[PDB]
Scaffold this active site. Structure first.
Site, mmCIF file in Angstrom:
data_model
loop_
_atom_site.group_PDB
_atom_site.id
_atom_site.type_symbol
_atom_site.label_atom_id
_atom_site.label_comp_id
_atom_site.label_asym_id
_atom_site.label_seq_id
_atom_site.Cartn_x
_atom_site.Cartn_y
_atom_site.Cartn_z
ATOM 1 N N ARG A 53 -74.569 -35.124 4.854
ATOM 2 C CA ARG A 53 -73.579 -35.867 4.384
ATOM 3 C C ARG A 53 -73.606 -36.381 2.923
ATOM 4 O O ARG A 53 -74.067 -37.549 2.757
ATOM 5 C CB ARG A 53 -73.256 -37.050 5.305
ATOM 6 C CG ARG A 53 -72.632 -36.521 6.640
ATOM 7 C CD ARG A 53 -72.905 -37.660 7.500
ATOM 8 N NE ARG A 53 -72.436 -37.260 8.854
ATOM 9 C CZ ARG A 53 -71.557 -37.790 9.846
ATOM 10 N NH1 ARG A 53 -70.346 -38.893 9.397
ATOM 11 N NH2 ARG A 53 -71.229 -37.348 10.970
ATOM 12 N N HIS A 85 -64.883 -39.850 8.409
ATOM 13 C CA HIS A 85 -64.144 -38.616 8.233
ATOM 14 C C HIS A 85 -62.700 -38.700 8.823
ATOM 15 O O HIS A 85 -62.581 -39.432 9.828
ATOM 16 C CB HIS A 85 -64.889 -37.373 8.716
ATOM 17 C CG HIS A 85 -66.308 -37.231 8.335
ATOM 18 N ND1 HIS A 85 -67.465 -37.829 8.573
ATOM 19 C CD2 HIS A 85 -66.595 -36.358 7.196
ATOM 20 C CE1 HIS A 85 -68.393 -37.218 7.818
ATOM 21 N NE2 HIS A 85 -68.050 -36.348 7.072
ATOM 22 N N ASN A 106 -61.458 -36.788 1.961
ATOM 23 C CA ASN A 106 -61.523 -36.596 3.405
ATOM 24 C C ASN A 106 -62.049 -37.934 3.985
ATOM 25 O O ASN A 106 -62.407 -37.807 5.442
ATOM 26 C CB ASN A 106 -62.339 -35.404 3.925
ATOM 27 C CG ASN A 106 -62.014 -35.111 5.392
ATOM 28 O OD1 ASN A 106 -63.198 -34.771 5.990
ATOM 29 N ND2 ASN A 106 -60.904 -35.229 5.632
ATOM 30 N N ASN A 115 -65.246 -45.870 14.315
ATOM 31 C CA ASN A 115 -65.733 -44.545 14.060
ATOM 32 C C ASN A 115 -66.779 -44.004 14.930
ATOM 33 O O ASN A 115 -66.811 -42.820 15.389
ATOM 34 C CB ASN A 115 -66.659 -44.636 12.810
ATOM 35 C CG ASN A 115 -66.965 -43.428 11.970
ATOM 36 O OD1 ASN A 115 -66.712 -42.528 11.955
ATOM 37 N ND2 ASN A 115 -68.419 -43.642 11.539
ATOM 38 N N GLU A 123 -63.169 -36.997 18.979
ATOM 39 C CA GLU A 123 -63.535 -35.635 18.314
ATOM 40 C C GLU A 123 -64.490 -35.029 19.179
ATOM 41 O O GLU A 123 -64.218 -33.797 18.992
ATOM 42 C CB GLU A 123 -64.524 -36.308 17.135
ATOM 43 C CG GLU A 123 -63.752 -36.787 15.919
ATOM 44 C CD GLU A 123 -64.569 -37.525 14.752
ATOM 45 O OE1 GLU A 123 -65.767 -37.981 15.139
ATOM 46 O OE2 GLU A 123 -64.240 -37.579 13.372
#
Ligand SMILES: [Mg+2]
Ligand SMILES: [Mg+2]
Lengths: 241, 241
Positions: A53, A85, A106, A115, A123
């Site tokens: 990252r 993200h 983004n 998150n 996700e």
């Protein structure tokens, strides 16, 4: 020639031009400093694990219209936010311009408990869809809401608007006109242990709270009928009722 | 081979062999004298309007195990029933064995106000789906329920059981694993002016009431998740919420 949306990218974003990449298509907001929406296309060839990252300013934007890595200094200590993200790294990091997933166009300041909790669990299930033999694509649009004051990043003097919530609208294969779909909306203050299945909404609610029209190439009658009806894709993602 | 089911024809029928035609696949019940389920596949080539209705004993069955035209004499007057199709004539009579749609294995004594009311309005919307450019198939399974004493056809001495209700399970294109689906269930005494949108159910309810497993070739996890969740196909058929 890159189509990240299949049934028309959203209308209504503050910018008249969007950034089109292999990783995603994104519509920036030069006032908030964050993307209004990010659309992406997961296939069996897009996931890759273990990428790093290296946050970077998006080189395709004017630097005055987006954030830079310096702008996040002190943000976790002040506000309990992560660099979160919008288009997810692990689901898309096999694409040819994957480093753009770590451009700050983004990213937004997303509460760590969201998150690392429900947002991450959604996700993971979104990505797992593509492992099914009869699912060849996942098409998603994600973005923020801007409805209450969430504070200011301490490390910047730029005007910016931290999101108050995040949404994700998903369908599989070719089009929500014929294929299963889902929509989810989470406040920033969602508890870390929250079950993402408790945050299902309609597409209509997200449109009403954003000023966007998602799936904007669908026929009018398809839009009117399906956008006010919660979809059944979450049942394939482990959710009940 | 003709596959009228796509994702496995139902299990649990009283007959171990089913009749397979272009018009439909059906599983007879020699006790009730009516089919346990009838599965059919609408495509752009199957609808045909204006066909005639020569009711006939199904030549593929033993005549003791099904009705004959004589058995319906006086039924309309005494019971206010019609010779109601299971697989619908106008949606399917373009196929090469279309006269089999008027064999009495495909007919039951169905209250006129249901046959000519909500059941017909649902048939009309079911058939209209195939006019959408992105809908290439409609796969349906339909059948009766036997949950209360409905009386007897006056014109026969054969043992038989008149249905108390009827159900219909529908999906589009390839499979309910990825495509929109619907399920409906109507009592015989549904009022003539009823809105078919008010009779949506889950597939699981129909299975528990009938003893069948519909879409029996789907993976277990797909069956468990989708069969307890009402589908969104009715929103494309004019229904709201
Ligand atoms: Mg994240
Ligand atoms: Mg009829």
């Amino acid at each position: 020639s890159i189509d990240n949306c299949a049934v028309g990218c959203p209308t209504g974003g503050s910018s008249n031009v969007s950034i089109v990449r292999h990783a995603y298509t994104l519509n920036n907001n030069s006032t908030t400093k964050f993307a209004n929406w990010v659309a992406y296309h997961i296939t069996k060839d897009t996931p890759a694990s273990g990428k790093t990252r290296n946050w970077k300013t998006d080189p395709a934007l004017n630097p005055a219209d987006t954030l830079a890595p310096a702008d996040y200094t002190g943000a976790n200590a002040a506000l309990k936010v992560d660099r979160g993200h919008q288009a997810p790294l692990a689901s898309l990091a096999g694409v040819s311009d994957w480093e753009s997933l770590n451009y700050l166009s983004n990213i937004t300041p997303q509460k760590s408990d969201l998150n690392q909790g429900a947002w991450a669990r959604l996700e993971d299930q979104e990505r797992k869809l593509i492992d099914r033999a009869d699912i060849s694509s996942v098409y998603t649009v994600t973005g923020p809401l801007y409805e209450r004051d969430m504070g200011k990043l301490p490390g910047t003097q730029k005007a910016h608007t931290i999101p108050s919530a995040y949404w994700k609208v998903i369908f599989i294969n070719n089009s929500p006109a014929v294929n299963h779909y889902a929509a989810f909306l989470f406040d920033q203050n969602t508890p870390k242990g929250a079950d993402f299945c408790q945050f299902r909404v309609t597409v209509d609610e997200i449109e009403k709270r954003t000023g966007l029209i998602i799936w904007a190439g669908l026929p009018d009658d398809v839009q009117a009928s399906l956008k006010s009806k919660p979809g059944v894709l979450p049942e394939l993602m482990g959710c009940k009722n």
